[PDB]
Write a protein that binds this ligand. Structure first.
Ligand SMILES: CC(=O)N[C@@H]1[C@@H](O)[C@H](O)[C@@H](CO)O[C@@H]1O
Ligand SMILES: CC(=O)N[C@@H]1[C@@H](O)[C@H](O)[C@@H](CO)O[C@@H]1O
Ligand SMILES: CC(=O)N[C@@H]1[C@@H](O)[C@H](O)[C@@H](CO)O[C@@H]1O
Ligand SMILES: CC(=O)N[C@@H]1[C@@H](O)[C@H](O)[C@@H](CO)O[C@@H]1O
Ligand SMILES: CC(=O)N[C@@H]1[C@@H](O)[C@H](O)[C@@H](CO)O[C@@H]1O
Ligand SMILES: CC(=O)N[C@@H]1[C@@H](O)[C@H](O)[C@@H](CO)O[C@H]1O
Ligand SMILES: CC(=O)N[C@@H]1[C@@H](O)[C@H](O)[C@@H](CO)O[C@H]1O
Ligand SMILES: CC(=O)N[C@@H]1[C@@H](O)[C@H](O)[C@@H](CO)O[C@H]1O
Ligand SMILES: CC(=O)N[C@@H]1[C@@H](O)[C@H](O)[C@@H](CO)O[C@H]1O
Lengths: 160, 324, 160, 324, 160, 324
């Protein structure tokens, strides 16, 4: 991870979480479970969607492209024509793979950055009312019930 | 009471490569590379393609005897030649600027074939029935091109002929013709009487003179002589005049062309089939929304950008760490 | 934000700050106001300047480029020539837009990273002598006067 | 006492797009795309362009009667043809390797026109005054090209002529000439006496023979005959020899070319104007430092790289969050 | 630095460290010295190695590419052929320099990110048992001997 | 007790540029740009290159008298022409489709030269010993091409000759020949008797007729006449027939070609040398693993992608801050 979060200080993922890419677990007296953070997950979905669309936009559509014939005394232009076809073919294959290769890295870092930020956000919300256990978990001091957990999620919580 | 912050994970097996690491399993991804086709030659714009089959453009335009099947076709979505399109010029000779004509046909979506010089009325003073050869057989008997007329002398006389045509088809008219070259001066006389004949063709922009070149050449399809083929695109309103004292293989049928961009000629052994598509390749039709495809570089219609890639998967989700 | 600072834990910008991109506000007894952090702002200006110049450098100058004529029997090379012109035209348009598109993202992240670092720097300077209020503000404990604020800025401050 | 860490913001409305988000307002940005021109054809290197106006390269070099305006021009920064450059070969015929000649002229910044074969002294034995035609009129009267001389028989005699020229201009010399083709053998005799004439042209590297091709062709500008135009670039020190027994349209004026890279021919309706620029396009001149422009792909001089883009703005400042 | 670590809050490098790119110094009673963090250094070496190889992979090998001649009446195709050679030449030179230019930035940030993460990792390991001096140093409270230092390195340490 | 976290540093002076900062010293880097060669022309695949030296392809194939050195060479790794490869067609004339032939030779790795028409047995009725000229000297005496035979009349008689060759070399056969053009009809008669001769060449696909073009042209190497050179690639099993009543410069030696992709012709003044390489350029051989090189765009074999770059160094280590 570029931001140390995913596969970093938060070792693994939750097959349990199933409403988004980023979320909370929570283990209150009333019970446990998982909850996805819409705010986060959506902004990510929008960004990634906009990214894929932007990539596709940059690539043009292939229209009618057929060969040409050349007689036995036109080997030079036959080759020139061939050099041009292979030429652009190699350029675009290069552009397509290189673009995808590089954006995949950026996308993964993007997610890593998002997890990281969600943590820091939650962290500065709880401040003293809990301690950093590790693996991205906060152990409360003032027993946080179900509606208390929810307050942390929607960023309302608020309690010095 | 505890509250943890984590991320999604699932049973996905999707993998993508990155600058720093190869084969990284992801939770979600989209394949951008199309690699499937139906292995069939379908129609575009609801119009069937012209399957030349055993014939090639030359055989089609000249009217090689083995291409009668194509006689009634006059509109197509694209032209198809096969690895067995060998029936072209049955009579040995050079087809001038042939590739160019092929290039011209690439933007022709249809034409109106017509008898520019009716056989039974355009040549009162020349014979119009002995123009056949064993090199261009039909039903075992000697024959000739359906769209040209091999004129020879009449009763030991070949008067200077002069025939003109004015184009009012309101569009380009493709006119084809030939110049015959007997192997000996004896044959030159048997066929055209005049020892020193010439063929002359002209329009507002075309102007060329031809001279018989008598000589025995290695036999091809039994012929030691040769027959050269020519063509020109007569513009709307222009006039083409043919003048000859022998050796002229006169035009019989010509074509008023209709341009209609977005078409071409392709070589394929894929079978034509009752089917539709917006994208066609020599291997078969593509039906995809993907930005790329690695089926074939030659394409007709609306298609994905061809590319040499084997895989092109873009990661959407995140690194999948199920840790089960 | 990729670094959670700009439009992140520091919600907005200061139309008030007008000497740089990054700066401090400060509200001492003696008075308030804004002050830009030269060190930061300059290193950013240098970097961005070097970035724009580097982009322009990669693009070449267009010299004399005129068409060619072809007669009625050279439609194949007329098209080959056309295929080459459109070919490189599409390649360079692609390169120019894609480069700009991608660097704009990098530039914004760059600024985000700079704000973030300026904060952390200031933070580790004050340590215990103040608390993190939020929105990138530090509330002092030992009443920091005008020349005290300045010490934080020029990184001299120094006081366990 | 409090100390906060923040970032700039202002009244900027500038916007840029990014991979993840479109239309992002920024505090500072630079436009890299130039999209303005003065809609005028200016001079480069302080030299005016050659405006062919109603004439085209053919009319200019051959000296079509309607191009006298161009006669005194011998240096230019670039050549300009318009949508109405129709005056070329007033006498119907084929101009061989015409496109090639145009390509050649693209690297010629000037020349020294000279009378290679003075009209009043180079042809003692042939008539030099009856070479006019209604196809090339001037002031309503029949005329002819200013740079060629249509030679015809003198007192029913057309002796074999032989004229040579040795090039000491120390540079390439463009020599142009023509070969006339009467519509009938009668005219062939009225003009040149000899029924079977020929024209021969040769140098150290050029060698070609021409034969009259008599035949009536669709009339163009009243002519059923044709006149073909030829040219060659005689190298320094080389010699060109013309030999003919009729049908030769002899060179009168020729051009010693001066190469000077960085020029060309453009088609434009933009008006020439008393103005200067370092960059010229068919639509008008560009005056910019920007790396790009979307004015026109065809360019002359020092210009920004053409691109199909509509917008190319690079963000320099940061996301603008004034939150007013 | 994009992550504020290298040439940031950890001002300089250690010519003394010579077993990796990232490491610890340590000044215990028993003695001083330097020690490289394998885990870190190796993952970096693997990534950079994979990066360089990936770059080289994207560039193709140049096979037999020789000129063509044209006669005095083929200046148009001679130029078309020339326009194509220069065309792809400029495209690939652009691609090669731009790729290298951009990855050099990414590589440096990568290292910066790694140093940064190594710190935060060590930091959350020590927690209360030491204080953050600055320059990436932790001053212990409970005298950490040689085998104690080692425990911090291999991430075993473990002591609330 | 203290524990610090730091990073490597050393005495490296390596520098790299980045988007934001130029000239950044790094601890480790790899140079991707190869810029060294041995300035020598070596052999590839263990085969020496064909050094034409003072001759050019024309001189080599026709057998110019100054190229006897090349006579015994029949296989090569690549062909080399120099800035002084001037010995080509010693007898002034046009070499038709010469560039095309050069292009053809670019994929020929070797051939089997053979006497297609033995000199002492193929022309019983024509003289085979007077075919020399001062334009193609050897040892100060008049001579001629080694691979062609200039046939002239025998005892004031030049009968219609007819010679054919059937190709069983199981591969393409390159056949070259010429057509001579005397400066005067007198010479036409001294050399070939027949005033109106013609040369005819044909195969299954080739068919062309030639006519003497008599005329005095500027002298080149003392010749006012001209000699045009032609060639064709006869396919396996096909037959080529030569028929002439004069002016034919008959084939003497021909070449059975062996294709072998991955070769070409280069122009260089670099010296051939007893050495091996997998990559060759006109300046010298490259021996590198680097992905790039800025030695030369023209290359033969396995080489690094050419690029205009001066420097291409990729950073591997980190920013070097020794702070000594
Ligand atoms: C008339 C013509 O040109 N058609 C030929 C035919 O003669 C020949 O027998 C057959 C086999 O190759 O191919 C084509 O059908
Ligand atoms: C029908 C006809 O013209 N016969 C020929 C046949 O003799 C020849 O073997 C074959 C292949 O070239 O082509 C044609 O089928
Ligand atoms: C000398 C010559 O070429 N005459 C014609 C002229 O009659 C005609 O009106 C003009 C425009 O159509 O073109 C040419 O100038
Ligand atoms: C056989 C032949 O071509 N002879 C000439 C030779 O006399 C001349 O010196 C050389 C270079 O100038 O070119 C040719 O080799
Ligand atoms: C021909 C040449 O100079 N190349 C040599 C190669 O033969 C040898 O195997 C290698 C060993 O270090 O060094 C160079 O690559
Ligand atoms: C040719 C074919 O079978 N492909 C069809 C396509 O025509 C249609 O547009 C698409 C969605 O409507 O569904 C595909 O399966
Ligand atoms: C009068 C004459 O010379 N012939 C044509 C004339 O028909 C036409 O109206 C004019 C303007 O286009 O161009 C001339 O060339
Ligand atoms: C050609 C033009 O109009 N552009 C002017 C240029 O002439 C002048 O030399 C320059 C000086 O700053 O300013 C440009 O805007
Ligand atoms: C003797 C001979 O044949 N060689 C001549 C040489 O003397 C002359 O200097 C050179 C000039 O181009 O031309 C060569 O053909």
């Amino acid at each position: 991870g570029l931001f140390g979060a995913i596969a970093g200080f938060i070792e693994g993922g939750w097959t349990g979480l199933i409403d988004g890419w980023y979320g909370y677990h929570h283990q209150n007296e009333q019970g446990s479970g998982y909850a996805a953070d819409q705010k986060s997950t959506q902004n990510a979905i929008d960004g990634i969607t906009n990214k894929v669309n932007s990539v596709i936009e940059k690539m043009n559509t292939q229209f009618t492209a057929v060969g040409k014939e050349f007689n036995k005394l036109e080997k030079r232009i036959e080759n020139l024509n061939n050099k041009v076809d292979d030429g652009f073919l190699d350029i675009w294959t290069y552009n397509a793979e290189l673009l995808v290769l590089l954006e995949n890295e950026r996308t993964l870092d993007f997610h890593d950055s998002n997890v990281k930020n969600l943590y820091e956000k939650v962290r500065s919300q709880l401040k003293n009312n809990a301690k950093e256990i590790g693996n991205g978990c906060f152990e409360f001091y003032h027993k946080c019930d179900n509606e208390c957990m929810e307050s942390v999620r929607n960023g309302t919580y608020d309690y010095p | 009471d505890t509250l943890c912050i984590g991320y999604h994970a699932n049973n996905s097996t999707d993998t993508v490569d990155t600058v720093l690491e190869k084969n990284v399993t992801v939770t979600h991804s989209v394949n951008l590379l199309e690699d499937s086709h139906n292995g069939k030659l379908c129609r575009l714009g609801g119009i069937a393609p012209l399957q030349l089959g055993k014939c090639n453009i030359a055989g089609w335009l000249l009217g090689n005897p083995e291409c009668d099947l194509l006689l009634t076709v006059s509109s197509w979505s694209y032209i198809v030649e096969t690895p067995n399109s060998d029936n072209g010029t049955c009579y040995p000779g050079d087809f001038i600027d042939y590739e160019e004509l092929r290039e011209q046909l690439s933007s022709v979506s249809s034409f109106e074939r017509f008898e520019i010089f009716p056989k039974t009325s355009s040549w009162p003073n020349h014979n119009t029935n002995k123009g056949v050869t064993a090199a261009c057989p039909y039903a075992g008997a000697s024959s000739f091109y359906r769209n040209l007329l091999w004129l020879v002398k009449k009763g030991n006389s070949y008067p200077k002929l002069s025939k003109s045509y004015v184009n009012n088809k309101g569009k380009e008219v493709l006119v084809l013709w030939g110049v015959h070259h007997p192997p000996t001066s004896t044959d030159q006389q048997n066929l055209y009487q005049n020892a020193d004949a010439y063929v002359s063709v002209g329009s507002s922009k075309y102007n060329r003179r031809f001279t018989p070149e008598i000589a025995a050449r290695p036999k091809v399809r039994g012929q030691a002589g040769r027959m050269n083929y020519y063509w020109t695109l007569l513009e709307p309103g222009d006039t083409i005049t043919f003048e000859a004292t022998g050796n002229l293989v006169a035009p019989r049928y010509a074509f008023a062309l209709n341009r209609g961009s977005g078409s071409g000629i392709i070589i394929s052994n894929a079978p034509v089939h009752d089917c539709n598509t917006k994208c066609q390749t020599p291997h078969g039709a593509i039906n995809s929304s993907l930005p790329f495809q690695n089926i074939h570089p030659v394409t007709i219609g609306e298609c994905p950008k061809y590319v040499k890639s084997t895989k092109l998967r873009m990661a959407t989700g995140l690194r999948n760490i199920p840790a089960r």
